Design a protein around this ligand. Structure first.
Ligand SMILES: Nc1ncnc2c1ncn2[C@@H]1O[C@H](COP(=O)(O)OP(=O)(O)OP(=O)(O)O)[C@@H](O)[C@H]1O
Ligand SMILES: Nc1ncnc2c1ncn2[C@@H]1O[C@H](COP(=O)(O)OP(=O)(O)OP(=O)(O)O)[C@@H](O)[C@H]1O
Ligand SMILES: Nc1ncnc2c1ncn2[C@@H]1O[C@H](COP(=O)(O)OP(=O)(O)OP(=O)(O)O)[C@@H](O)[C@H]1O
Ligand SMILES: Nc1ncnc2c1ncn2[C@@H]1O[C@H](COP(=O)(O)OP(=O)(O)OP(=O)(O)O)[C@@H](O)[C@H]1O
Ligand SMILES: Nc1ncnc2c1ncn2[C@@H]1O[C@H](COP(=O)(O)OP(=O)(O)OP(=O)(O)O)[C@@H](O)[C@H]1O
Lengths: 489, 48, 283, 492
């Protein structure tokens, strides 16, 4: 209804640069007269839908007192191509009559798609009306247009050229302190007790979009109502599903660097490559090239390869692209080299972001001039791998990890400084690393301190760490049976 | 280990915009449209 | 329509020169010569209208092969009554295949020196670009117009990119693009030798084409272009060095005597480096 | 509040060329009398977006006072009953009623393009309406039509004829100090300081067609008002334009890198012999192309390269884009390969058509083993096969003009997948195997990275280079990459 500036946070660094983009040309239009140039007209926002894209425009509208015009995306484009061009003509004419005014539109990708091979849509007569309407009207008129969309790369490139939509903001998912701020906002009216937490409740979410905070609060409040005929927040996480459900942004395992033990020749050797350019890049611009992207992990089965995959992904709280081994789906002949490229461009958009792969080295088997071969896959997708891995940029500093279990079939062209070069053998856990791994896994178990795991490390000499995970699982599965035969009598 | 690729094609529409039958217009003339407030319309008599 | 562009552009070029502070505006020869340079004919990657042919002794040797090519594009034109009196169908198609180097154009365009008609050819980019209809409909105006717009010579090349997997034992399963090997065969029996038609097939692999293209009645004359020997490789170096200021004091045989497995492309490779350092002497 | 002839610079050669075909049919039509010919009507402009096509159309309209008209691309395209065919002839008779007049049709490729894709819709009968409309313009010296588009190859070739649309002109890129004229127009209204200089801006802004230059001075004004926390004297400074260079992208949102990667001649380690042989490439015959016409022979068409990976097949492959600053393009190996079967031969066609249109240009290839495929398709049986991708470029590269600056250069790692006709002379002549560097050339391999970093002179330059006993040129980058994370170690 009547929202203000203090209702949302997280994007406060972007909220400050928005307040100089839509409020400064409206409240002080004479400042651009002194500098000579015209004030900007179009600023667009993007990101995941449900971070408050529609609530952000209504917050800055009520905090300025200006006119607030709204044209919906999938509403005015569903007409029969004749009333949409007059609705946009009525939109700019009414905003000029009652200046100062803002114009907020949402879902502009439904209005402005891209031109592709699947022609047959209308795709015209509406966006071209917006082109000839927006390039004028700059005769020091107090009007601005604000666009909003979900996918920022499905928009037509003619809009983001100059003078129509030139400034962009990236309101994404908040950090651990960002979800902590919106947790205090959405719980200002619920009479909670002193047993609830705020920092631990924000840190246990780690992937929750801001729309989920209103739903997770109402689910825990409804459970407290039902028990009349307040730690029900953990009950709400077990019942409700988090948003961005089946995407590549999964975070449900919250294993940190404390829960994984040993391998100190890998923990400090992963701190050297993927946390140094993403935190201190001032020394990397004068000491050669910045990024150390590729890193290889090889060893015995169950040596702890993917146990450290999500651990580094939650230390800097960046995104984690979990691509499996046979993800080259290969439905035809040409898309198998194309479905690996858009996930690399997505890593450049959400940079920095760790990418994972598994056993995709197949140029040693792609010999020249033979008969036994596939129809275009596993012999030409390595030719795409020889040109899409070193596609770097100084403004992104991405990094890609790689875990395998066979270091004998490494390609002679993939063991190169332009490719994944830093190969590190992941060894067996010795008698000192056996205690550091297993004690961090039974931290959740309310065990007795009489049983020390030094006898387990003396009984396990050539055992892997995953085999030691079966021992604490068997000790917990019989502690369940010890707890089953405790309440029945 | 092979593929099948085939594209498509469409035809959009044509229109005529034919309407207004004559029997609807003959009923459209013989009606009223309303008169403000005091715009009586009168009667008259004569020819005894 | 292109002849109207040749006179109108030369007059527009002349008034761009004569302009200062209408007395004499006679169109000169250099204005028409400039109009031939900056403009172009109607061949804007459409059906090609040109007659680029070379004369004799431009391919080296051929002193025993020139009598084998004079009986397919000259004798149906010079003496048509020898086929009508007997009753035989003249072979309007000759398949060409040979070693690397030469073989594609200069061994086929040097045969038709006496006709010099329009040459409408199919090539690399003239393939299945549209997925519907325009696969053999772009060839239907080549087959039916060859007897209507006679004389017209049609050259056929890139045989491994039209009917390679479709005509084989495995074929095409699904009806996606199996519409290529049908019109190439059903337009053979439907075409007679009423007008002046001529087709030439050339490829680097003669066994990669469908065997129904080599059906009897249409390809009964098979002419094989061989590798140029030592008596022909020396005249190759005298042929591709035509417009050059060549000193005749040297021996071009000594270059060709060291070429046994080296074809005319390697003879072009050994002569391009001799022209790289020749301009470097002027530099 | 309208623009004029002095409103835009940088295209002064194209301005005086386009001013002849609009002023002479209108101001002094008597030159076409007593010469026999008819004055032409169509002028065709084409180029990249942001070059000022609609700006040049409005500038020539207001400076002559003629009856200007505007026809938009996506606006007049109807599906009701053929109303686009009635509204095109409606605009022609309205322009014929007022003399003199000028019409303008922007994005003409959007209205009835070439029939390689559609071929059956109403756009086939839309373009044929435009054929009889322009050919029926027997009213002499009344209407002059100008058009603007972005791709001249997507339009139907029936427009490029004598009557309707001849005398095409390409609006190029203002590289020869043309961006200084754009900066003189935009920054003449803003308040300036003494430290700024427009000559020190065009030399660093490669590309920059003109739309981003207007965005650069506006973004530099945003940096000036950013420090004001809020009678006012702001000005500009040299650091504002330097802030707008790094914090704003140039015209590269469509493709990431197409121009260069900012390297030079001495960035490849060793290999001074291939630096001499690279002076026989397109650096050589551009400034003297008449010597090959005098000597009567075509120059070298293609040089091929193959060998160990990581020895300079991306550095030297992009060093040609900096030693002449030609119209470079960047295309990967299987990125040329498409998902559709009918696109398998036309994707190499539009790349080669852009090469002859952007002369002089530099193209390259990487990982031709996915493109050559010397067996010619693995098994078959499918609706489409891997045989038209190699049999099309072997013929199209032969059907190119020699005097159009077209060439190829190779970068492969497998000498057996490539076809013998790929390495044919006349298409790829010089079979040059790139060598592994010896002990005399591996000293400048480390020096390619030590040129930009301040290495201490007490450290011996050849002591680290003497540990190589058969290494590659990229392996000494791995040492300075290992030293990039081993040098700091205490400053956290
Ligand atoms: N700072 C914030 N961050 C995230 N969510 C918030 C914040 N403040 C409030 N919310 C909650 O999130 C919701 C905002 O969602 P919104 O109305 O933007 O839907 P949307 O799908 O993003 O909009 P659109 O339909 O334009 O995509 C509100 O209902 C509000 O309760
Ligand atoms: N530091 C460690 N050393 C040994 N084992 C570990 C360690 N940390 C975790 N583990 C256990 O090992 C398992 C890791 O298995 P993961 O599949 O990730 O690697 P892996 O066993 O080498 O498998 P693969 O051989 O397919 O790579 C986890 O289930 C975990 O319980
Ligand atoms: N008489 C000749 N003998 C050999 N080579 C010649 C002769 N005359 C010219 N040449 C050179 O040899 C080349 C001929 O090669 P050509 O174009 O036939 O390639 P090809 O591979 O044989 O053709 P295709 O692609 O049909 O196999 C020309 O470029 C020309 O310079
Ligand atoms: N002389 C000039 N040369 C190039 N660009 C200029 C010049 N003067 C101004 N500009 C800038 O370039 C832009 C002109 O682009 P324009 O509006 O013509 O887009 P366009 O894509 O060419 O038009 P259309 O949509 O008709 O193709 C202006 O926004 C202006 O800031
Ligand atoms: N003169 C040089 N010689 C050898 N290596 C060099 C030289 N200059 C720079 N390098 C380093 O070597 C690397 C060049 O490797 P490149 O990108 O060519 O990989 P590549 O495998 O050869 O390419 P491709 O994928 O085409 O085979 C660069 O990352 C650079 O740091």
């Amino acid at each position: 209804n009547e929202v203000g500036y203090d209702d949302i946070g997280g994007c406060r660094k972007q909220m400050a640069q928005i307040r100089e983009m839509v409020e400064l040309p409206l409240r002080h239009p004479q400042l651009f007269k002194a500098i000579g140039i015209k004030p900007p007209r179009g600023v667009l926002m993007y990101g995941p839908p449900g971070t408050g894209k529609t609530l952000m425009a209504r917050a800055v509208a009520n905090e300025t007192g200006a006119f607030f015009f709204l044209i919906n995306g999938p509403e005015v484009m569903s007409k029969m191509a004749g009333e949409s061009e007059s609705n946009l003509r009525k939109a700019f004419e009414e905003a000029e009559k009652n200046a100062p005014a803002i114009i907020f539109i949402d879902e502009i990708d439904s209005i402005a798609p891209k031109r592709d091979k699947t022609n047959g849509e209308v795709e015209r007569r509406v966006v071209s009306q917006l082109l000839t309407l927006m390039d004028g009207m700059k005769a020091r008129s107090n009007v601005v247009v604000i666009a909003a969309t979900n996918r920022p790369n499905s928009i037509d490139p003619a809009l983001r050229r100059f003078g129509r939509f030139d400034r962009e903001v990236d309101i994404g998912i908040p950090d651990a302190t960002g979800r902590l701020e919106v947790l205090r906002i959405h719980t200002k009216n619920m009479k909670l007790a002193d047993d609830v937490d705020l920092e631990a409740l924000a840190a246990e979410t780690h992937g929750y979009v801001g729309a989920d905070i209103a739903s997770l609060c109402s689910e825990a409040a409804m459970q407290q109502i039902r028990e009349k005929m307040m730690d029900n927040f953990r009950f709400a996480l077990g019942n409700s599903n988090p948003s961005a459900l089946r995407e590549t942004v999964v975070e449900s395992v919250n294993v940190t660097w404390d829960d994984v033990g040993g391998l100190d020749e890998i923990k400090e050797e992963l701190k050297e490559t993927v946390e140094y350019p993403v935190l201190h890049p001032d020394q990397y611009t004068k000491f050669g090239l910045s990024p150390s992207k590729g890193v290889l992990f090889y060893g015995p089965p169950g040596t702890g390869k993917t146990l450290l995959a999500k651990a580094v992904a939650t230390e800097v709280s960046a995104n984690f692209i979990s691509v499996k081994g046979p993800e080259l789906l290969s439905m035809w002949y040409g898309e198998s080299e194309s479905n690996i490229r858009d996930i690399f461009d997505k890593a450049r958009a959400a940079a920095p972001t760790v990418v994972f792969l598994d056993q995709l080295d197949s140029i040693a088997k792609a010999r020249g001039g033979s008969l036994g071969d596939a129809g275009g896959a596993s012999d030409r997708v390595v030719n795409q791998l020889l040109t899409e891995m070193d596609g770097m940029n100084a403004k992104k500093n991405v990094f890609v990890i790689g875990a395998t279990n066979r270091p004998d079939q490494i390609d002679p062209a993939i063991l190169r400084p332009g490719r994944l070069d830093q190969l590190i053998y992941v060894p067996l856990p010795d008698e000192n690393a056996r205690l550091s791994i297993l004690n961090a896994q039974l931290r959740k178990t309310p065990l007795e301190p009489g049983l020390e795991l030094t006898a387990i490390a003396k009984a396990t000499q050539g055992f892997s760490g995953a085999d030691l995970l079966y021992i604490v699982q068997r000790a917990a599965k019989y502690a369940i049976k010890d707890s089953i035969e405790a309440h029945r009598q | 280990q092979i593929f099948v690729k085939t594209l498509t094609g469409k035809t959009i529409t044509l229109e005529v915009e034919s309407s207004d039958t004559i029997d609807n217009v003959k009923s459209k003339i013989q009606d009223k449209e309303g008169i403000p407030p005091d715009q009586q319309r009168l009667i008259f008599a004569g020819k005894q | 329509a292109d002849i109207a562009s040749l006179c109108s552009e030369a007059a527009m070029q002349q008034i761009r020169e004569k302009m200062d502070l209408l007395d004499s505006l006679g169109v000169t020869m250099d204005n028409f010569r400039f109009a031939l340079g900056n403009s172009n004919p109607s061949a804007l990657r459409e059906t090609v209208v040109e007659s680029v042919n070379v004369t004799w002794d431009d391919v080296g040797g051929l002193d025993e092969i020139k009598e084998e090519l004079k009986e397919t594009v000259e004798y149906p034109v010079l003496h048509p009554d020898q086929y009508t009196k007997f009753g035989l169908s003249p072979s309007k198609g000759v398949l060409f295949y040979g070693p690397p180097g030469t073989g594609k154009t200069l061994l086929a365009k040097a045969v038709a020196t006496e006709v010099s008609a329009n040459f409408i050819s199919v090539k690399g980019p003239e393939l299945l670009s549209m997925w519907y209809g325009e696969s053999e409909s772009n060839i239907r105006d080549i087959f039916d117009k060859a007897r209507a717009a006679a004389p017209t010579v049609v050259f056929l090349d890139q045989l491994d990119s039209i009917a390679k997997a479709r005509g084989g034992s495995l074929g095409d399963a699904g009806g996606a693009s199996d519409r290529v090997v049908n019109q190439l065969l059903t337009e053979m029996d439907g075409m007679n030798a009423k007008k002046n038609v001529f087709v030439i097939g050339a490829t680097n692999r003669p066994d990669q084409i469908d065997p129904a293209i080599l059906r009897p009645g249409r390809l009964d004359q098979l002419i094989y272009v061989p590798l140029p020997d030592e008596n022909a490789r020396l005249s190759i170096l005298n042929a591709q060095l035509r417009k050059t200021p060549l000193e005749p004091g040297l021996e071009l045989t000594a270059i060709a005597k060291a070429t046994q497995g080296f074809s005319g492309a390697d003879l072009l490779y050994i002569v391009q480096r001799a022209a790289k350092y020749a301009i470097k002497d002027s530099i």
